[PDB]
């Protein structure tokens, strides 16, 4: 009389480390649950989905919670309450790392609540559980039966001694000049997040491709575990709306195409709405004339259509919504010393995206204690990124930064950090904060730009300025276009969003989010080549403003004291 029907996939020596995936002992009431071990780090991941759709859904409600338990490392928490509480920085980033590549793999049209939680149970002080968490969540999701077209594999890739190293340990990362985390399906890399010591597009792309090859073993293992242990696939067919699309196309299609050829903002709109309200009338509206399709569901299908057209118009000619060529970058102006009393300050404007970035310098008191499982440590480069709603002409709730704001700060932090001077040459803590005052496509590269500028303006001896750009891709079966410095609404109109930042010597951070299969390494090679043109350009516009660090730090403030007179007093004392 045996409880627990355990099924394991143990095999996988995975690059010289054992990866076990276990299921059927733990958390049997979840849709999928996997205890996953790699070396001696253990997480449990679980996946639960609602078996029906809340009325009037809209969008796909996925949520992901990665969470560390400090017992995983033999310690009690340091807080006054000695319990773990709100997510830390690492816990937020990680939840975002898992969410990013799962979200697009769920079948189009599926809109039931889905939650994934990943709990770190043991940490071996070598193998990071963040990669394991990713693999684990993937595993739990395939096993659950949810309409998830995975699995995803994931891997970290380092660059040590002139070679890729797979899943390097915490000690190995100390000697690595790249921190590349990738996630992908069998077909496609789906997500990249990195911090790099000025290494070339070819080498960074090499790393991506490497991760993609090396993650295949885990994908194979997950399918093996799925095949022995998965639940019944949840039935869910989406809607052959596919039909009346053809309909409304041939109709308002030629209309919409020349509608977009109109320039003059207003009017252009005008034409579009006409086209809608039209095919709306005698189409999908139903009543008065059946039938019909529920109108305003015919709207959804229309948007799809103008999108396909906008996408085609782009591929024939290289012309965009705002009139740029796929290579054109928006006008730029950067300006420093805008808040003269602040240690260093910059205003950076690219088109309609703008960031005020100010830099403050402090000492040992000002470093942030972060107590990680893996060890407790002090942090002296801080970057806080603030995205107020007035930046998009909207109202919303203030205080308490979200997943999105933590993650952007992070993506700028990774862009700038490889280039700070060393503690020995410049013993300060650096807090940058950045207020996005207008946003229309890449506020987070704006903050990278602003941040170079603010730091040089503060006299931080950065070894090289850094600039970043945000890029998109329209991919079709007959051609593709890479877009330079995308507008915010082009964002939801491409198959791939990435941002590249770096110095005049090579990259510093590459972030990618891919929505579909078919981006060849040939196509990424280009994409990164056009981005290189852009960031060089942008860096050039930035040098008009500062070029090199100031030699000294601001009047206010410190060293320590704000006076050289008080320092000499102390020294003599």
């Amino acid at each position: 009389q045996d409880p627990m029907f355990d099924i394991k996939r143990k095999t996988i020596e995975w690059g010289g480390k054992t990866l076990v995936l276990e299921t059927g002992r733990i958390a049997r009431q979840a849709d999928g649950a996997v205890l996953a071990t790699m070396g001696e780090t253990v997480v449990l991941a679980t996946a639960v989905f609602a078996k029906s759709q809340k009325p009037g859904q809209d969008f796909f409600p996925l949520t992901v919670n990665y969470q560390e338990k400090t017992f995983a490392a033999g310690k009690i928490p340091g807080g006054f309450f000695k319990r773990e509480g709100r997510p830390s920085e690492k816990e937020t980033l990680v939840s975002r790392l898992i969410d990013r590549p799962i979200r697009p793999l769920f079948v189009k049209g599926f809109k039931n609540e889905v939650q994934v939680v990943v709990t770190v149970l043991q940490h071996d002080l070598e193998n990071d559980p963040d990669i394991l968490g990713m693999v684990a969540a993937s595993a739990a999701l395939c096993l659950s039966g949810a309409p998830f077209m995975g699995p995803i594999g994931a891997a970290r890739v380092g660059w040590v001694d002139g070679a890729y190293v797979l899943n390097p340990t915490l000690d190995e990362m100390k000697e690595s000049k790249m921190d590349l985390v990738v996630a992908g399906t069998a077909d496609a890399v789906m997500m990249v997040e990195s911090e790099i010591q000025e290494l070339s597009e070819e080498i960074v792309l090499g790393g991506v491709n490497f991760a993609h090859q090396q993650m295949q073993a885990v994908i194979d293992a997950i399918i093996d575990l799925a095949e022995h242990a998965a639940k019944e696939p949840f039935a869910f067919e989406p809607e052959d709306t596919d039909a009346i699309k053809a309909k409304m196309k041939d109709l308002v299609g030629a209309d919409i195409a020349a509608a977009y050829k109109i320039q003059k903002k207003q009017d252009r709109y005008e034409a579009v709405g006409a086209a809608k309200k039209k095919a709306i009338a005698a189409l999908g509206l139903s009543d008065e004339n059946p039938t019909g399709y529920d109108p305003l569901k015919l709207g959804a299908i229309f948007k799809e259509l103008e999108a396909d057209v906008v996408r085609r118009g782009i591929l024939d000619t290289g012309l965009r919504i705002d009139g740029r060529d796929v290579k054109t970058v928006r006008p730029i102006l950067g300006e420093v010393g805008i808040l003269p009393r602040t240690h260093g300050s910059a205003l950076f404007t690219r088109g309609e995206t703008q960031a005020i970035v100010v830099a403050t310098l402090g000492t040992g008191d000002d470093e942030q204690f972060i107590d990680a499982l893996e060890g407790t440590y002090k942090e002296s480069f801080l970057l806080h990124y603030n995205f107020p709603p007035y930046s998009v002409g909207e109202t919303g709730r203030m205080g308490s930064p979200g997943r999105r704001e933590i993650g952007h700060g992070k993506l700028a932090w990774r862009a700038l950090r490889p280039m700070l001077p060393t503690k020995e040459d410049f013993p300060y803590t650096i807090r940058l904060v950045s207020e996005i005052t207008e946003s229309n496509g890449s506020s987070s590269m704006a903050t990278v730009c602003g941040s170079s500028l603010a730091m040089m303006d503060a006299g931080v001896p950065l070894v090289r300025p850094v600039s970043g750009i945000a890029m998109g891709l329209i991919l079709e079966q007959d051609g593709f276009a890479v877009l330079s410095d995308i507008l915010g609404d082009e964002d939801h109109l491409g198959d791939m969003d990435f941002k590249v930042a770096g110095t005049s010597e090579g990259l510093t951070s590459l972030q990618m989010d891919i929505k579909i299969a078919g981006i060849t390494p040939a196509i990424m090679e280009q994409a990164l080549a056009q981005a290189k043109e852009g960031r060089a350009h942008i860096l050039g516009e930035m040098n008009k403003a500062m070029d090199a660090p100031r030699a000294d730090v601001g009047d206010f403030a410190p060293k320590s004291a704000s006076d050289g007179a008080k320092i000499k007093a102390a020294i003599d004392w």
Partner: peptide, 7 residues
């Protein structure tokens, strides 16, 4: 055997 969405 085993039939679902990962294919």
């Amino acid at each position: 055997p085993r039939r679902g969405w990962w294919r």
